[PDB]
Structures are given as structure tokens and as C-alpha cells.
Design an enzyme around this catalytic site. Structure first.
Site, PDB file in Angstrom:
ATOM      1  N   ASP A 139      33.402  -3.863   7.583  1.00 56.75           N
ATOM      2  CA  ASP A 139      32.135  -4.224   8.215  1.00 56.75           C
ATOM      3  C   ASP A 139      31.399  -5.292   7.465  1.00 56.75           C
ATOM      4  O   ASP A 139      30.162  -5.350   7.498  1.00 56.75           O
ATOM      5  CB  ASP A 139      31.250  -2.993   8.467  1.00 56.75           C
ATOM      6  CG  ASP A 139      30.123  -3.207   9.420  1.00 56.75           C
ATOM      7  OD1 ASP A 139      30.180  -4.098  10.325  1.00 56.75           O
ATOM      8  OD2 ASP A 139      29.126  -2.424   9.250  1.00 56.75           O
ATOM      9  N   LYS A 142      33.009 -11.405   8.860  1.00 55.30           N
ATOM     10  CA  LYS A 142      34.127 -11.160   9.752  1.00 55.30           C
ATOM     11  C   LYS A 142      35.358 -11.979   9.391  1.00 55.30           C
ATOM     12  O   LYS A 142      36.480 -11.549   9.689  1.00 55.30           O
ATOM     13  CB  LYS A 142      33.693 -11.386  11.217  1.00 55.30           C
ATOM     14  CG  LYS A 142      32.472 -10.604  11.650  1.00 55.30           C
ATOM     15  CD  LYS A 142      32.461  -9.111  11.184  1.00 55.30           C
ATOM     16  CE  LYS A 142      31.102  -8.499  11.280  1.00 55.30           C
ATOM     17  NZ  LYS A 142      31.006  -7.224  10.472  1.00 55.30           N
ATOM     18  N   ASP A 167      34.761  -2.630  12.395  1.00 53.22           N
ATOM     19  CA  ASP A 167      33.618  -2.882  13.263  1.00 53.22           C
ATOM     20  C   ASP A 167      33.688  -4.252  13.878  1.00 53.22           C
ATOM     21  O   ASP A 167      34.251  -5.201  13.293  1.00 53.22           O
ATOM     22  CB  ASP A 167      32.262  -2.709  12.504  1.00 53.22           C
ATOM     23  CG  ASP A 167      31.063  -2.604  13.437  1.00 53.22           C
ATOM     24  OD1 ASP A 167      31.277  -2.165  14.603  1.00 53.22           O
ATOM     25  OD2 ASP A 167      29.908  -2.901  13.002  1.00 53.22           O
ATOM     26  N   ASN A 168      33.032  -4.448  15.025  1.00 55.68           N
ATOM     27  CA  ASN A 168      32.705  -5.784  15.540  1.00 55.68           C
ATOM     28  C   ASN A 168      33.912  -6.556  15.993  1.00 55.68           C
ATOM     29  O   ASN A 168      33.909  -7.783  15.909  1.00 55.68           O
ATOM     30  CB  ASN A 168      31.896  -6.605  14.549  1.00 55.68           C
ATOM     31  CG  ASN A 168      30.655  -5.915  14.120  1.00 55.68           C
ATOM     32  OD1 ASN A 168      30.478  -5.656  12.907  1.00 55.68           O
ATOM     33  ND2 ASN A 168      29.779  -5.601  15.066  1.00 55.68           N
ATOM     34  N   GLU A 197      25.257  -2.329  18.278  1.00 55.86           N
ATOM     35  CA  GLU A 197      24.121  -1.580  17.840  1.00 55.86           C
ATOM     36  C   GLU A 197      22.836  -2.037  18.503  1.00 55.86           C
ATOM     37  O   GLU A 197      22.511  -3.228  18.530  1.00 55.86           O
ATOM     38  CB  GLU A 197      24.006  -1.632  16.302  1.00 55.86           C
ATOM     39  CG  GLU A 197      24.061  -3.042  15.703  1.00 55.86           C
ATOM     40  CD  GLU A 197      25.414  -3.478  15.217  1.00 55.86           C
ATOM     41  OE1 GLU A 197      26.433  -3.143  15.845  1.00 55.86           O
ATOM     42  OE2 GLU A 197      25.428  -4.252  14.223  1.00 55.86           O
TER      43      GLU A 197
HETATM   44  C1  LIG Z   1      33.066 -10.430   0.639  1.00 58.21           C
HETATM   45  C2  LIG Z   1      32.059  -9.345   0.668  1.00 58.21           C
HETATM   46  N1  LIG Z   1      32.090  -8.393  -0.293  1.00 58.21           N
HETATM   47  C3  LIG Z   1      31.143  -7.431  -0.305  1.00 58.21           C
HETATM   48  N2  LIG Z   1      30.108  -7.330   0.527  1.00 58.21           N
HETATM   49  C4  LIG Z   1      30.120  -8.256   1.504  1.00 58.21           C
HETATM   50  C5  LIG Z   1      31.096  -9.278   1.639  1.00 58.21           C
HETATM   51  N3  LIG Z   1      30.811 -10.046   2.725  1.00 58.21           N
HETATM   52  C6  LIG Z   1      29.713  -9.552   3.234  1.00 58.21           C
HETATM   53  N4  LIG Z   1      29.229  -8.489   2.489  1.00 58.21           N
HETATM   54  C7  LIG Z   1      28.076  -7.652   2.860  1.00 58.21           C
HETATM   55  O1  LIG Z   1      28.359  -7.025   4.100  1.00 58.21           O
HETATM   56  C8  LIG Z   1      27.179  -7.135   4.942  1.00 58.21           C
HETATM   57  C9  LIG Z   1      27.366  -8.171   6.000  1.00 58.21           C
HETATM   58  C10 LIG Z   1      28.073  -8.007   7.083  1.00 58.21           C
HETATM   59  C11 LIG Z   1      28.314  -9.048   8.145  1.00 58.21           C
HETATM   60  N5  LIG Z   1      28.114  -8.405   9.450  1.00 58.21           N
HETATM   61  C12 LIG Z   1      27.801  -9.135  10.508  1.00 58.21           C
HETATM   62  O2  LIG Z   1      27.756 -10.345  10.429  1.00 58.21           O
HETATM   63  C13 LIG Z   1      27.490  -8.388  11.765  1.00 58.21           C
HETATM   64  C14 LIG Z   1      26.878  -9.141  12.762  1.00 58.21           C
HETATM   65  C15 LIG Z   1      26.503  -8.590  13.982  1.00 58.21           C
HETATM   66  C16 LIG Z   1      25.846  -9.392  15.046  1.00 58.21           C
HETATM   67  C17 LIG Z   1      26.177  -9.164  16.385  1.00 58.21           C
HETATM   68  C18 LIG Z   1      25.562  -9.925  17.398  1.00 58.21           C
HETATM   69  C19 LIG Z   1      24.630 -10.877  17.032  1.00 58.21           C
HETATM   70  F1  LIG Z   1      24.039 -11.582  17.988  1.00 58.21           F
HETATM   71  C20 LIG Z   1      24.301 -11.121  15.709  1.00 58.21           C
HETATM   72  C21 LIG Z   1      24.919 -10.391  14.742  1.00 58.21           C
HETATM   73  C22 LIG Z   1      26.753  -7.201  14.158  1.00 58.21           C
HETATM   74  C23 LIG Z   1      27.359  -6.431  13.178  1.00 58.21           C
HETATM   75  O3  LIG Z   1      27.617  -5.119  13.340  1.00 58.21           O
HETATM   76  C24 LIG Z   1      27.745  -7.013  11.953  1.00 58.21           C
HETATM   77  O4  LIG Z   1      28.369  -6.235  11.061  1.00 58.21           O
HETATM   78  C25 LIG Z   1      26.034  -7.506   4.009  1.00 58.21           C
HETATM   79  C26 LIG Z   1      26.774  -8.450   3.048  1.00 58.21           C
HETATM   80  O5  LIG Z   1      26.085  -8.711   1.843  1.00 58.21           O
HETATM   81 CL   LIG Z   2      23.120   2.094  19.139  1.00 56.89          CL
HETATM   82 CL   LIG Z   3      25.895  -0.024   8.647  1.00 53.88          CL
HETATM   83 MG   LIG Z   4      29.001  -4.400  11.959  1.00 53.11          MG
END
Ligand SMILES: Cc1ncnc2c1ncn2[C@@H]1O[C@H](/C=C/CNC(=O)c2cc(-c3ccc(F)cc3)cc(O)c2O)C[C@H]1O
Ligand SMILES: [Cl-]
Ligand SMILES: [Cl-]
Ligand SMILES: [Mg+2]
Ligand SMILES: [Cl-]
Length: 213
Positions: A139, A142, A167-168, A197
Site C-alpha cells: 500500500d 504504486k 491495495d489500489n 476509500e
Molecule cells: C518506498 C516506501 N517505503 C516506505 N514507505 C513508503 C514508500 N513509498 C511510500 N511510502 C509511504 O506509504 C504511504 C503512501 C502511499 C501511496 N498511496 C497512494 O498514493 C494512494 C492513493 C490513492 C488515491 C486514489 C484516488 C485519488 F484520486 C487520489 C489518491 C488511494 C490509496 O489507497 C493510496 O494508497 C505514505 C508514504 O510515506
Molecule cells: Cl470506505
Molecule cells: Cl491505511
Molecule cells: Mg491505498
């Protein structure tokens, strides 16, 4: 302050300490009524709950904690003695996730690792005494799903029967990962259609069970 901090504060002002369900409900209410956030949410969360109960994993890895919603979801369903490792690159989010878990009373079940997944994954065996993973929840960013899946395999962390749950896979999508697992004889894949969500937009989870080399 940030949206992530605002979610934590709302939980602290509205949930019951030691009550994971009340934490989840408070997050969902805030994100429905006040400000959307990318937590996995209740729709997909119910699917996650049914998968975790089905497999009863002893060791789960989460890639991308965010605010800890999914970590609370999963940790509250783990059998006694089972454990979750969650990796979160953003230090602010790692701290929010730790505090969320502490509030929920789940801290003894979870280890929150602050760092990039590609840096932490190679340390799991030696530093965290991991043999292999029973389940992995993907998650994070992506474009990292496929690189990290390949890295997990390289590092010897997958066993026959390890369950990947991603996810996603519809929105935003993870096209390289999804094509890869669906095309690979080393995965058995099943799609669980759901909803983004807090939105009336179709999304889904992909379950990809590793078959070995
Ligand atoms: C490489 C790495 N290592 C550890 N933590 C990592 C990582 N890359 C991201 N992270 C962490 O995961 C989290 C990020 C996740 C990315 N998830 C998303 O971009 C994401 C985006 C949407 C979304 C859907 C429709 C829309 F219109 C807009 C957005 C919905 C979701 O459920 C998501 O998970 C926080 C970040 O610091
Ligand atoms: Cl929901
Ligand atoms: Cl979450
Ligand atoms: Mg997600
Ligand atoms: Cl990175």
C-alpha cells in the site's frame, strides 16, 4: 499542522484507548465528514479482515503505513503471538502510526520501521530475525509494488504460500505489478472488487499467492 496530524488528534479526542474498533470508526468518520485521506477504508478493510481471518498469518509485512489505519485493522485480527512489521518512509507518518497503535493498545503486536522499503527489506533477516513472511500488504507508492515484490523474492523472504495482498490495483492502479503477477506462473491471483476509500469509485484488492521458484 497536517491532515495526518489532524486525523490523529480527532482519534485522541473521539476514540477509546485500547479499543481498536473505536479508532477505526473515528478515522472513517473524520475522513468521511471532514477531510478525505488515503486510508484503505471500511469497504476494502472488510475484505482485508476476511482475508486475514482466512489465512491466520503469524508474520505480516506492510509496505506503507501512512497513519496506521491498516496496521490497526490487521493487528487487531492477529492471533496471539502473531506479529506485524510495517515500513514507513516518512518520519512524521511513522510517528503518527506508532501513536495510533499505542492509542489502540496494539503496540506489542507491531513494529513500525521508519525507512524506505527498499533499504529495510534487505535487513529483515539479519536485523529483524525474519525467516519468511506469511503475508505482505502492499500500500505504498504504486510504482514500488513490483520492484519491492522482486526484492522480497531476491532476499529469500517469500515462501511457497506467502500471500501478497495489494491495495489500489484499479485506482490509482499499479499496472506493472498487476500485469506481472497475473502473467507469472509463480503467483496464483484473485481479484476482490470494492470501492475506493470514502468514495463511490470502483477499486479492488489483488491477492497473489507465491508458488515458489
Ligand atoms: C518506498 C516506501 N517505503 C516506505 N514507505 C513508503 C514508500 N513509498 C511510500 N511510502 C509511504 O506509504 C504511504 C503512501 C502511499 C501511496 N498511496 C497512494 O498514493 C494512494 C492513493 C490513492 C488515491 C486514489 C484516488 C485519488 F484520486 C487520489 C489518491 C488511494 C490509496 O489507497 C493510496 O494508497 C505514505 C508514504 O510515506
Ligand atoms: Cl470506505
Ligand atoms: Cl491505511
Ligand atoms: Mg491505498
Ligand atoms: Cl525512496
Amino acid at each position: 499542522d497536517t491532515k495526518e496530524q489532524r486525523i490523529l488528534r480527532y482519534v485522541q479526542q473521539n476514540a477509546k484507548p485500547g479499543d481498536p474498533q473505536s479508532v477505526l470508526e473515528a478515522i472513517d468518520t473524520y475522513c468521511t465528514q471532514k477531510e478525505w485521506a488515503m486510508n484503505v477504508g471500511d469497504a476494502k478493510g472488510q475484505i482485508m479482515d476476511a482475508v486475514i481471518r482466512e489465512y491466520s498469518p503469524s508474520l505480516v509485512l506492510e509496505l506503507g503505513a501512512y497513519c496506521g489505519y491498516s496496521a490497526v485493522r490487521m493487528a487487531r485480527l492477529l492471533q496471539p503471538g502473531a506479529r506485524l512489521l510495517t515500513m514507513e518512509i516518512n518520519p512524521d507518518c511513522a510517528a503518527i502510526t506508532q501513536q495510533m497503535l499505542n492509542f489502540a493498545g496494539l503496540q506489542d503486536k507491531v513494529t513500525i520501521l521508519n525507512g524506505a522499503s527498499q533499504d529495510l527489506i534487505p535487513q529483515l533477516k539479519k536485523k529483524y530475525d525474519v525467516d519468511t513472511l506469511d503475508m505482505v500488504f502492499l500500500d505504498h507508492w504504486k510504482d514500488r509494488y513490483l520492484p519491492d515484490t522482486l526484492l522480497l523474492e531476491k532476499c529469500g523472504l517469500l515462501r511457497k504460500g506467502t500471500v501478497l495482498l495489494a491495495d489500489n490495483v484499479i485506482v490509482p492502479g499499479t499496472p506493472d505489478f498487476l500485469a506481472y503477477v497475473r502473467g507469472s506462473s509463480s503467483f496464483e491471483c484473485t481479484h476482490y472488487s470494492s470501492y475506493l476509500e470514502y468514495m463511490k469509485v470502483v477499486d479492488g484488492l489483488e491477492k497473489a499467492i507465491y508458488q515458489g521458484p
